[PDB]
Amino acid sequence: GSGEADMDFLRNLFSQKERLLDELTLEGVARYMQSERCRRVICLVGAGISTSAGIPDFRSPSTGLYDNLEKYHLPYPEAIFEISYFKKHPEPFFALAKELYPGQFKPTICHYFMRLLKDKGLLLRCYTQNIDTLERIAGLEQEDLVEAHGTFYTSHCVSASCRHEYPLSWMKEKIFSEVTPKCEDCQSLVKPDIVFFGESPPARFFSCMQSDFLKVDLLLVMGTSLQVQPFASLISKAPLSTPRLLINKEKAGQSDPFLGMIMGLGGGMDFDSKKAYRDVAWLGECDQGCLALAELLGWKKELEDLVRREHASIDAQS
Ligand SMILES: [Zn+2]
């Protein structure tokens, strides 16, 4: 390949060992988090943090969700999230969005735990797979978040020459009234800032992925398998001394041999080999693990009060 020199040029430009936990347990993590050294925490979260809110298993065809979409005849399943298809045929996506827009679910204990991390100046960043808006509803702000698949909170005209922004109430009204949103300036489609196939993600995603893991003191991985992009790559970016806690129902089994080898060679999770020194798995429901961890930090009541207050505020304002 005559391209190898160019690939070497870029790789050289973009190229980037203590035991800090006294014990590989939740209790050890909680003590570490109270130590001076634990200043910057990154959470990586997936669908398991929202199950307890009632968010459905979207893999199942058996719930409300997709029946309404038969009439559209998609040419392949991903077409509903592909930008060139959306531009010609926006209706299927907007029919799905009607189900997915927030309003019907509240954040979980796990979300509010991340709100406490923010309140306490510990949260460097939350990387989320989810598109349920629950992190934002819990009070994490855009600067706190890298939403891997984007967000329904913000919306923009799709034309690169315009890119007018529209607020959630403007969109939600249109979607609920089954009016396809058009830009008032240029008449192009307006879509929520969900990152479609074929679309560029916000630049800040890469910049955060390239910076944040250089000086992170603790990774909290909740409600996701380790073998999911981009998370597989991001945990292996942390400093070798940085402790990493997984809170999830189950540890995933092996999913592929390249990804598996890569993990093992690259500084993937090691909870229980003879070389284990910094990774902890806590297996159970995300809410239960965050309750437990909060109790260890002396935050039980603060967290309880926060959940109750915020849930009541959602009731009051619905
Ligand atoms: Zn426009």
Curated annotation (Swiss-Prot):
Report the co-factor binding details.
Binds 1 zinc ion per subunit.
Q: Which residues carry this modification: Phosphoserine?
A: S62, S169
Major place of localization? nucleus
Give the active-site positions.
H149
Free-text tissue specificity from the UniProt record: Isoform 1 is expressed in heart, liver and skeletal muscle, weakly expressed in the cortex. Isoform 2 is strongly expressed in the cortex, weakly expressed in heart and liver. Weakly expressed in several malignancies including breast, liver, brain, kidney and prostate cancers compared to normal tissues. Weakly expressed in glioma cell lines compared to normal brain tissues (at protein level). Widely expressed. Highly expressed in heart, brain and skeletal muscle, while it is weakly expressed in placenta and lung.
- Keywords, comma-separated and alphabetical: Acetylation, Autophagy, Cell cycle, Cell division, Cell membrane, Cell projection, Chromosome, Cytoplasm, Cytoskeleton, Differentiation, Immunity, Innate immunity, Meiosis, Membrane, Metal-binding, Microtubule, Mitosis, NAD, Neurodegeneration, Neurogenesis, Nucleus, Phosphoprotein, Transcription, Transcription regulation, Transferase, Ubl conjugation, Zinc
Q: What is the effect of changing S273A?
A: Reduces deacetylase activity
Effect after changing T242A: Reduces deacetylase activity
**Keyword Calcium appears in the UniProt entry:** no
Query: Which reactions does this protein catalyse?
Result: N(6)-acetyl-L-lysyl-[protein] + NAD(+) + H2O = 2''-O-acetyl-ADP-D-ribose + nicotinamide + L-lysyl-[protein]; N(6)-tetradecanoyl-L-lysyl-[protein] + NAD(+) + H2O = 2''-O-tetradecanoyl-ADP-D-ribose + nicotinamide + L-lysyl-[protein]; N(6)-hexadecanoyl-L-lysyl-[protein] + NAD(+) + H2O = 2''-O-hexadecanoyl-ADP-D-ribose + nicotinamide + L-lysyl-[protein]
**Motif extent (Nuclear export signal):** 10-16
Q: Does the keyword Transport apply?
A: no
Q: Which cofactor does it need?
A: Zn(2+)
Instruction: State how it assembles.
Output: Interacts with CDC20, FOXO3 and FZR1. Associates with microtubules in primary cortical mature neurons. Homotrimer. Isoform 1 and isoform 2 interact (via both phosphorylated, unphosphorylated, active or inactive forms) with HDAC6; the interaction is necessary for the complex to interact with alpha-tubulin, suggesting that these proteins belong to a large complex that deacetylates the cytoskeleton. Interacts with FOXO1; the interaction is disrupted upon serum-starvation or oxidative stress, leading to increased level of acetylated FOXO1 and induction of autophagy.
Q: State what protein this is by name.
A: NAD-dependent protein deacetylase sirtuin-2
Q: Which organism is it from?
A: Homo sapiens (Human)
**Full-protein interval shown:** 34 to 356 of 389
